[PDB]
Design a protein around this ligand. Structure first.
Ligand code: ADP
Ligand code: ADP
Ligand code: MG
Ligand code: MG
Lengths: 438, 440
């Protein structure tokens, strides 16, 4: 309430400062910029306050980013970074740029030398992120490691050896369980847990409250993140159980504002008597908007209903797509194009979570699909796509339709978010069923 | 070889010493005996050498035992105790008294205050053992805890709080996994791992090293016992995989000699062509010896063959019994009576492992089955049983028949051991198939 305000206003000013250092940093040469880290390390080494070089450090990361990726951190992203450095939960909507916002607090912390642990929901994302978030990090003179399941102890010492590490909550935890069952300390792959930046905190710290089972026993990984000196998370959904975050991990939730006004239209739930009445009113809806030239993603609670709705959808003569959270790699390729004017995708709970759905398709997947990277063909794609885009927009952007509400609204909010991002005009609808009286 | 000898001879002398202190300790009053622990604690507290009060400490445990249970530790048992205090694997045959031999090294170690972890193959045994091994321990002024699966954290702090604790390898391990996923140290149920005495070491440290699957992750409790300051084990089969014990846990195997000469007769494997030829030659064999008045246990590799042989055995008109390692508690009650002159039992891999099969039945289960514990009726059982006993013996004691050899001889040796214990005359037979005898 007035608390979220005073706290946002609080650092909102520190944000203004960062923007003031922009004309300066804009001048420092590449070598002078890169070497900005040495200075920060010395400064800190001299015992200077951690949270003291935040405005200056964040100003650097923005600059490097703008130079390496050509992406200037939105001040709202800076706002988010700051929250991520305080044992807070920065809530930022889907499409807001959490992936890049983390380079900020991950850079500030990756200076002391203790390492930084960015957590993700799955292996594909963890590596994917590290992969294309690395150039910014290698520029600023840091090393990025990727921790995965089948990595021999040697490799894992490497991935945890870097200044910045990426992995999934499980593997990190599993490594910790395995390090305790270690022969000799020199056989351990981790180090003293320092800072953990959790991407999709709710998913990781709340839904993953469902114990794993050893077979016969069962344990949880709840407390694993409480062993970290610094624990911080980010998500596009947190205010729901915003109380549980502090009752366990003592994490204060800060709802960051969006960059561009959120104009997506969340339509009222239409209730039907039978499952058939539902699935039929939706295939009738997609089939409709389809012609209109508007893309539409469908969400299902489980593969179960996902399969069923898939056939009922192909039966009405409709070429759709299905993602069951099995092949993240490939699903991701597909979800990244569900923004094409004529596109229908059926995703499950954690189907293509993590891939930004650009209105009108993603031309980058188009250019990366041409052995001949010439500034000529790209133009007839970066401008060709541009057409499909504004077209899809005029057509009300992306429309998602929940086949059913989850036990937790938070969950069936993650679905909505896949739409109307970075200011995009889109819409969402939920189709409930009376027959769901179970 | 000459190594096992020099090492056995080595402590064999320390054994002689223990026997010399017997006439002395025999005089100390109950209170003076019990208070023998205080002295040991003080002595050690004064910084005296651990392995220095072994001959004296073991002499005490024998005395207390002789008094509380009325069981004087065989010197060979004392031999075993010693081995169990050195990061060794004391190999002692089935029926040799491992359960009581552990009170020795478990007492020596349960003095420093760090606790002692006796490991068993299953929950039933772990509690069963603590239960009726306690009186000796409470006498000598020590507390005994029992760690089990559904015990709330509170309870578990208790069981690990005692001087001596009993549980299964898994639960101990599981506790350790759960202690690492603890909120705050004050939420942990274990203490720093000190001494672990593994009963049935091969089973626990070799067969069990099969990796539990987290659900996805794969880890092994192989290293769990390597975190213990002191690791020691005991079994009636270790000499086989004696090399793997040191290549992982660095444990030297010591083959302790038996109390009474081992006269059981292990007969040659009879190979048959078909499974029917097998199961038929065995039901023909048990049906035979049955009449003779000799009991016979059958071992199967899995419940699979166990069920099959059970029907084929009842089909020939034979009242038998079956244990599938499901209800340890009950099976145990039954295995303890498979020594009755006319008894047929079909057990699986880990069916009634742990229960000593007395020739002629177990009268103790008979006396404990009478609300009226009078010195009168017991006599007509302790002397009545005595008849069945010598009778079963003359009939060649217990005869076990393996329905099929296991991948590891060690395993199908555990079967044999269920017979001919403490000197008993018995016999064992293995019935293989042709599509096996082709060992090539
Ligand atoms: N500061 C920025 N400037 C320009 N584009 C950005 C910026 N930050 C993020 N993006 C783009 O917007 C999308 C939103 O990023 P994403 O990683 O999917 O974050 P989130 O998890 O919040 O949805 C990305 O695909 C990225 O290409
Ligand atoms: N010192 C002893 N004096 C008398 N009986 C003993 C002694 N030690 C062991 N026994 C008996 O011999 C049997 C062997 O015990 P058990 O627990 O089955 O050990 P093991 O693991 O060697 O088979 C027990 O039933 C017990 O009654
Ligand atoms: Mg993301
Ligand atoms: Mg035993």
């Amino acid at each position: 309430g007035s608390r979220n305000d005073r706290t946002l206003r609080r650092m909102r000013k520190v944000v203004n400062i960062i923007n003031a250092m922009e004309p300066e940093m804009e001048k420092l040469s590449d070598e002078e910029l890169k070497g900005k880290t040495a200075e920060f390390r010395a400064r800190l080494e001299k015992g200077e306050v951690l949270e003291n070089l935040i405005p200056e450090a964040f100003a650097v990361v923005r600059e490097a980013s703008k130079r390496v990726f050509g992406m200037r951190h939105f001040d709202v992203q800076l706002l988010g970074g700051m929250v991520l450095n305080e044992r807070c939960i920065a809530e930022m909507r889907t499409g807001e740029g959490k992936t890049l916002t983390a380079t900020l607090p991950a850079y500030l912390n990756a200076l002391t030398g203790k390492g930084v642990h960015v957590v993700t929901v799955n292996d594909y994302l963890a590596q994917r992120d590290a992969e294309n978030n690395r150039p910014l990090f290698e520029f600023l003179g840091l090393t990025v490691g990727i921790n995965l399941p089948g990595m021999p102890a040697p490799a894992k010492r490497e991935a945890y050896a870097a200044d910045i590490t990426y992995g999934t909550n499980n593997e990190y935890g599993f490594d910790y369980l395995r390090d305790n069952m270690a022969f000799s300390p020199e056989e351990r792959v981790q180090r003293k847990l320092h800072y953990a930046l959790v991407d999709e905190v709710d998913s990781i710290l709340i839904d993953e409250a469902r114990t794993p089972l050893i077979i016969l026993a069962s344990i949880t990984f709840q407390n694993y993140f409480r062993l970290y000196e610094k624990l911080a998370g980010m998500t596009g959904t947190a205010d729901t159980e915003a109380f549980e975050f502090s009752s366990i991990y003592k994490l204060d939730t800060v709802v960051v504002p969006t960059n561009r006004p959120m104009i997506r239209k969340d339509l009222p739930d239409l209730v039907y008597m039978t499952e058939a009445e539902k699935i039929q009113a939706i295939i009738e809806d997609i089939k409709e908007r389809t012609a209109k030239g508007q893309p539409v993603l469908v969400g299902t609670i489980s593969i179960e209903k996902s399969e069923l709705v898939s056939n009922e959808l192909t039966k009405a003569g409709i070429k759709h797509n299905v993602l069951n959270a099995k092949f993240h790699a490939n699903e991701a390729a597909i979800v990244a194009q569900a923004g094409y004017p004529a596109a229908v995708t059926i995703a499950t709970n954690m189907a293509g979570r993590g891939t930004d759905i650009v209105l009108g398709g993603s031309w980058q997947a188009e250019v990366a699909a041409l052995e001949n990277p010439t500034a000529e063909q790209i133009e007839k794609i970066k401008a060709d796509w541009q057409v499909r885009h504004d077209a899809v927009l005029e057509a009300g952007g992306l429309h998602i339709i929940g086949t059913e509400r989850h036990e937790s609204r938070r969950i069936d909010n993650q679905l909505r978010g896949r739409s109307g991002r970075q200011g995009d005009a889109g819409s969402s609808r939920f189709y409930l069923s009376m027959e769901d009286a179970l």
